Design a protein around this ligand. Structure first.
Ligand code: SAH
Length: 373
């Protein structure tokens, strides 16, 4: 459906008094949680901090009325904030300065998992000065109640200030000293293709604590098709690199790998993973191929695209992955993609490459395609 032009296109949408840029892959718009926040938040003090900005809809009401800092981890969303002219920093929630804010706005990043959420909760508690306030928004169907009560335990006072369907916004006040940030880094050893690796990652990464079965299947298929030395000295693009499940092995195999990842936490995870294993590769914080030059081309492109649990529809970002792969590959170059059995990638590859091959069919399927000039 979406073309590369359309995926990377930044579209400004109107709202009373201004405009806000949104784009495919950027969270925040058409989101009930952020929408309820926008209708609830009001100025308090002089310094505010948004720990889950997205396109900036939730804390927009504070814009122009008090100093507002936005810590964004999504490159896609960051592009939007930048285009909208909204003060924002490429940073993790827990990188927020302690005791420097009067107000904190936080739409619960439930989709990121409990670890990421709790880290954000403590970050908010630490960022606030004693007496500071926190606007916490969420979905009761997505743990709002649990996190709200945990937030209350961390700060003290806290009550719901707005309701709409299962969506909620609570306002809490820091009455007690915040605890230290919990340990954020995790590490686990894994063997891939007969080699040992030690992966390091922060909260919220895909397949935390273990190498994903699908990722392993892709590498197995790749080695069978190209051989153990098949990627040596070759330029490889890893779409959605994560903490490096595919990136590290390929780099160790001698390839010159470029990993593009939209999530900041995942990017830092990849960087430390490479360092810890004495491997070198480009860990780019990028919305698909946004960070690349117009001329950049590759010999091999691999990917374990994002997907919705239990869904049979390919995500826009995933579709973009395929479009970019086809456009970024040099004639004769090869594309490797792994996905659950419920995603209709075949007709997509057929369209973009003209033909494809199924290398493996198990719990997951590994598809292959060669770029024709
Ligand atoms: N717009 C985007 N641009 C780049 N990467 C993205 C993206 N949207 C999602 N991703 C990342 O794509 C990865 C898909 S999950 C797989 C991760 C890793 N390749 C592995 O095999 O373990 C995740 O890291 C997800 O955060």
């Amino acid at each position: 459906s979406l073309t590369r032009e359309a995926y990377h296109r930044l579209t400004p949408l109107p709202h009373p008094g201004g405009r806000l840029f949104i784009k495919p892959g950027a969270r925040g718009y058409r989101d009930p949680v952020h929408d309820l926040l926008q209708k609830t938040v009001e100025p308090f003090g002089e310094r505010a901090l948004d720990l889950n900005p997205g396109v900036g809809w939730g804390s927009l009401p504070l814009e122009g009325r008090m100093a507002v800092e936005r810590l964004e981890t999504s490159r896609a969303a960051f592009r939007c904030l930048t285009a909208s002219g909204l003060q924002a920093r490429l940073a993790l929630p827990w990188e927020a300065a302690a005791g420097a804010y009067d107000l904190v706005v936080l739409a619960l990043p439930a989709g990121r998992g409990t670890a990421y959420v709790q880290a954000s909760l403590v970050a908010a508690a630490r960022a606030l000065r004693m007496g500071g306030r926190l606007y916490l928004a969420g979905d009761k169907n997505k743990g709002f109640e649990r996190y709200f009560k945990e937030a209350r335990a961390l700060l003290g006072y806290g009550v719901v200030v707005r309701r709409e369907g299962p969506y909620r916004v609570a306002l809490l006040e820091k009455e007690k000293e915040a605890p230290p940030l919990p340990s954020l880094w995790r590490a686990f050893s894994a063997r891939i293709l007969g080699a040992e690796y030690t992966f390091h990652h922060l909260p919220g990464v895909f397949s935390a604590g273990k190498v994903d079965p699908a990722s392993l299947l892709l590498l197995e298929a790749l080695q069978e098709r190209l051989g153990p030395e098949g990627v040596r000295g070759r330029q490889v693009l890893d779409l959605g690199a994560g903490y490096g499940a595919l990136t590290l092995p390929l780099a160790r195999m001698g390839a010159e790998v470029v990993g593009v990842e939209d999530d900041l936490a995942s990017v830092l995870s990849l960087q430390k993973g490479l360092e810890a294993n004495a491997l070198k590769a480009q860990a780019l914080h990028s919305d698909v191929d946004e960070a690349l030059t117009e001329e950049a081309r590759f010999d091999i492109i691999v990917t374990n695209p994002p997907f919705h649990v239990g869904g049979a529809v390919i995500l826009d970002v995933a579709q973009a992955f395929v479009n970019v792969a086809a456009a970024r590959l040099r004639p004769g170059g090869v594309f490797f993609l792994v996905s659950n059995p419920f995603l209709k990638y075949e007709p997509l590859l057929e369209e973009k490459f003209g033909a494809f091959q199924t290398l493996k069919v198990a719990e997951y399927k590994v598809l292959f395609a060669e770029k024709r000039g």
